[PDB]
Amino acid sequence: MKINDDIKELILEYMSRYFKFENDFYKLPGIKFTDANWQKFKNGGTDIEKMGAARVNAMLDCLFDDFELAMIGKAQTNYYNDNSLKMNMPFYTYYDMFKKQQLLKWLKNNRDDVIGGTGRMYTASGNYIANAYLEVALESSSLGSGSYMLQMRFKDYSKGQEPIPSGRQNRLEWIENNLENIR
């Protein structure tokens, strides 16, 4: 894990994904910006390499799961060792590609083990957002009291007004047919 400006663009992109109003994100406990400091941080003003470690590691944890903070280090490892990837695209597009490849390996090797559900995210006033993302886990890596060790977090970008079905078979089949509308 390294902290640089690519992590700032990744934080800004995923904040733009899960939160419709920005006031819900930067006023969370642990992050706790003001409006002037947010308009300074968002507009390239203040450095991220010199910020507090607790504030950066609280911004990284609300948007990524505890397993998705492992694929950021491996994405940074394979991204700073290839001239064919640095010039073409930014870091978050490669991160989305990495996450989708690991999902494809999950669906190939361990297809009768993949479970999922709707996730809810807590905003800056405590009132949560029902169905903020779609969480996808491996049931063999269950841990205890409803927490999983291998877990991912997607979001659907679909045009048809038809929600994701419930049950293990219908949800797995929806994920298999719509493997392009999730980022």
Binding site: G116, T118, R120, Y122, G126, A137, E139, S142, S145
Partner: protein, 836 residues
């Protein structure tokens, strides 16, 4: 030598104990519980069988999609146009060719609205709206309504060339089947891929309906609300397990009133209660039974004439008969046996006796064609009933609704077969024969027998709480000599049967409240000392805790929000909208003046269309909306020529946004919320670093059914999110949890003062560690009453909301038993319970 006295009220039960010699007061307390109002299971049952309609509507659409996909007509379902007119496509495709996508929109709009089916002031309007179906399909009716009046759906009045009347979009579901059959026959003549199995499967999708005696479920779904039970069985009629049991054999089902045995018993008991100047013998009884059996037309008059000629004296000498409303002679005949002799295809004369009892069980329970046609297969012998016989008894039971819709006898066939040989010879009633024949927890008293015989829902809860108080008292203070109490006779008989079968005599008695009011007038916390008065004729509190987890999480009403600046805002804030419905109504005009006087710019119309707000400002000034309605019609919008739309409603910025659930859709533009979210419990934490308590707060909405197994829990990461919000540090330690009506002790550490309250909730979610407290001794906490030195005063309204993150307090949890003996704890467990 102790005396127990109980005061059994609506929402409280008082209890006291005396010693009967010295008269000292041993114990006195009061149990307080909520009253079991019957309005809550009505809301739960209404929403339970109101979600099934939405579920089956959606499943009709799913089955239609699978039908189109399986027959090869449409492959993918993404590019179907939302913005066509379905009614024009229905009326057009009666005689033309629709190219596999217009047919989909037509048939889907058909199955989204099918009609009423019970017809095989409201009925007068369906009578008016059904005469035009003699030559037109409902699609034609709705299309002419659409292109004549503009408006199609709802119920709406309109003025035609003749007279003002009413229009309603309800048509019977026979016309929808006829229209769909014509459409699919024409499209089968055009499209050769519509098979006859396709139109049959679609027509079973459209007009399919379960029956009222079938209930929910499937062969493999196995719900316990209809048939197909979870025990592996399968009923025929889900009301066939609700039939009550016999009076003297509590494992036998009752007998049908129109059986052979019930009518034989009723006639043999009807004329043994008849005294003739001295009772009728066995031979004349067998003769009159054979005379009422083999007779085409019997009655209550010809029976009295026949007994008058059989004993040869007269008719008016006889006394003992059952009189009627208007004074006559009423006596049982074999009415269902003489009526069942009018069947030309099946002969009942040489038919068995038990077969005449199963034929009245089937014809008494089942009322439809499919019920009787299905309940003649499993119960009876295989065969034994031809199809013409089955149809003739189906139209027989449909023709006689008053005879077979009477009900069920209060005895059984197994018992009534033990008296019919007896009341032939010995001329007696049923009661003397049953008297001369005699048919009729190990330490504590169980509640299953006594709540069984209470049916008022307010009384049964009080009865169970009094039973629990009695069980706790005889566990604590040995045994008594008197149990005096205060629907009423059955607990007397239950306690008497309990102590009588246990070979220990205690005087259990009731007393009237007028006597005790007389005692209070004569002799000179409200339930306690009055229960002591009850036990004298011969404190501590115990509340009931509310700890049920799945309750109403929020409203079901969907609200719309907008981002605006109303009044004195510096930046854009989110605002919950409202709506004035039916402006012409008197309450709509009072509400319009209520919004209009305090703020003019709260309306959305004033900010986006101001020109037409200079057409609503004149009828409120120089004319109020109902007068303009009857004068010129509705208050139309602003245009150059008078073709603007009408005005019936006005939506406005109602309020600011507080507690909610954000249920905004995928492709939305504004935030869409659910309001009115309620709290459940609170967890109490403590840290030795600062030395002050922290208090979480959970809601009903924070838990969910989880994603792999379906269990109801809250995970640890979401719990840590709620911990981060509410100000609880991560190295604090967990003390206990508090539900509703739990007793909470607050003790000061500098000057050692103690109070204890009841927990209510965790109000004001802007400050931290604020908690609402209810009083210990009373039920209102009214006034500006003072408290201990660290908390402060009760507020002006009567609501104690205190921030318990103080610097000197200390907090304990009190667990009172049913008698009120308080046990004070300080540390419940290692980890709060999250999995249920």
């Amino acid at each position: 030598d102790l005396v127990l006295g109980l005061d059994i009220g609506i929402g409280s039960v008082g209890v006291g104990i005396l010693n009967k010699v010295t008269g000292e007061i041993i114990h006195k307390n009061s149990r307080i519980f909520p009253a079991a109002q019957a309005e809550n299971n009505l809301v739960r049952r209404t929403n339970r069988q109101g979600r099934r309609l939405t579920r089956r509507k959606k499943h009709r659409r799913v089955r239609l999609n699978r039908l189109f996909e399986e027959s090869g007509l449409i492959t993918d379902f993404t590019k179907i146009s939302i913005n066509l007119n379905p009614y024009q496509l229905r009326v057009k495709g009666l005689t033309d060719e629709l190219s596999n996508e217009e047919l989909f929109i037509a048939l889907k709009n058909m199955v989204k609205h099918r009609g009423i089916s019970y017809l095989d002031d409201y009925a007068q309007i369906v009578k008016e709206n059904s005469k035009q179906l003699e030559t037109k399909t409902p699609g034609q009716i709705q299309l002419e309504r659409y292109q004549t009046y503009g408006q199609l759906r709802g119920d709406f009045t309109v003025e035609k060339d003749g007279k003002k009347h009413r229009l309603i979009n309800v048509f019977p579901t026979s016309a929808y089947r006829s229209e769909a059959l014509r459409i699919l026959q024409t499209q089968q003549e055009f499209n050769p891929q519509i098979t006859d199995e396709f139109i049959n499967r679609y027509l079973e999708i459209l007009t399919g309906k379960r029956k009222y005696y079938h209930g929910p479920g499937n062969e493999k779904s196995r719900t316990d609300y209809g048939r197909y039970r979870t025990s592996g069985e399968t009923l025929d009629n889900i009301f066939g397990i609700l039939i009550g049991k016999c009076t003297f054999y509590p494992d036998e089902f009752r007998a049908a009133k129109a059986s052979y045995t019930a009518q034989e018993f009723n006639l043999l008991n009807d004329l043994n209660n008849l005294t003739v100047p001295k009772k009728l013998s066995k031979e004349q009884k067998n003769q009159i039974i054979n005379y009422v059996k083999n007779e085409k037309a019997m009655g209550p008059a010809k029976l009295f004439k026949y007994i008058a000629k059989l004993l040869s004296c007269d008719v008016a000498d006889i006394k003992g008969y059952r009189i009627d409303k208007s004074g006559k002679a009423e006596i049982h005949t074999f009415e269902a046996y003489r009526k069942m002799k009018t069947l030309e295809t099946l002969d009942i004369e040489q038919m068995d006796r038990e077969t005449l009892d199963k034929l009245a069980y089937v014809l008494t329970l089942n009322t439809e064609r499919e019920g009787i046609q299905e309940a003649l297969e499993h119960e009876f012998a295989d065969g034994s009933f031809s199809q013409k016989q089955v149809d003739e008894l189906v139209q027989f039971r449909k023709a006689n609704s008053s005879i077979f819709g009477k009900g069920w006898h209060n005895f059984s066939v197994k018992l009534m077969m033990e008296l019919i040989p007896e009341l032939y010879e010995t001329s007696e009633e049923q009661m003397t024969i049953l008297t001369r024949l005699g048919k009729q927890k190990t330490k504590y008293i169980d509640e299953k027998l006594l709540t069984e015989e209470i049916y008022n829902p307010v009384v049964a809860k009080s009865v169970r709480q009094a039973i629990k108080i009695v069980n706790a008292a005889i566990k604590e203070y040995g045994d008594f000599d008197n149990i005096v109490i205060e629907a009423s006779r059955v607990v007397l008989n239950a306690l008497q049967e309990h102590f009588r079968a246990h070979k220990i005599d205690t005087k259990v008695s009731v007393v009237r409240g007028q006597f005790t009011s007389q005692l209070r007038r004569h002799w000179g916390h409200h339930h306690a000392v009055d229960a002591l008065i009850i036990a004298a004729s011969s404190i501590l509190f115990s509340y009931q805790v509310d700890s049920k987890f799945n309750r109403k999480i929020s409203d079901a009403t969907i609200y719309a929000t907008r981002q605006a600046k109303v009044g004195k805002d510096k930046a854009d804030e989110t605002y919950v909208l409202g709506k004035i419905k039916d402006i012409y109504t008197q309450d709509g005009y009072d509400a319009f003046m209520k919004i209009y006087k305090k703020d003019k710019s709260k309306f959305l119309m004033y900010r986006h269309d101001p020109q037409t707000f200079e057409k609503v400002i004149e009828p409120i000034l120089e004319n109020p909306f109902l007068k303009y309605k009857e004068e010129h019609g509705y208050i139309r919008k602003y245009s150059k020529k008078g073709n603007g739309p009408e005005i019936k409603s006005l939506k406005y910025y109602d309020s600011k946004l507080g507690n909610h659930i954000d249920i905004t859709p995928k492709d939305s533009n504004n935030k869409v919320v659910l309001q009115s979210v309620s709290p459940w419990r609170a967890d109490v934490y403590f840290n030795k670093t600062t030395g002050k308590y922290e208090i979480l707060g959970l809601k009903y909405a924070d838990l969910q059914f989880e994603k792999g197994t379906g269990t109801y829990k809250i995970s640890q990461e979401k719990y840590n999110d709620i911990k981060k919000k509410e100000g609880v540090d991560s190295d604090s330690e967990f003390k206990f949890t508090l539900y509703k009506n739990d007793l909470l002790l607050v003790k000061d550490t500098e000057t050692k003062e103690q109070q204890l309250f009841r927990f209510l909730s965790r109000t004001m979610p802007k400050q931290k560690h604020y908690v609402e407290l209810k009083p210990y001794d009373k039920q209102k906490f009214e006034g500006g009453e003072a408290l201990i030195k660290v908390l402060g005063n009760v507020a002006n309204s009567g609501q104690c909301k205190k921030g318990l993150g103080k610097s000197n307090i200390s907090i304990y949890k009190v667990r009172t038993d049913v008698l009120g003996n308080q046990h004070i704890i300080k540390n419940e467990g290692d980890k709060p319970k999250l999995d249920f």
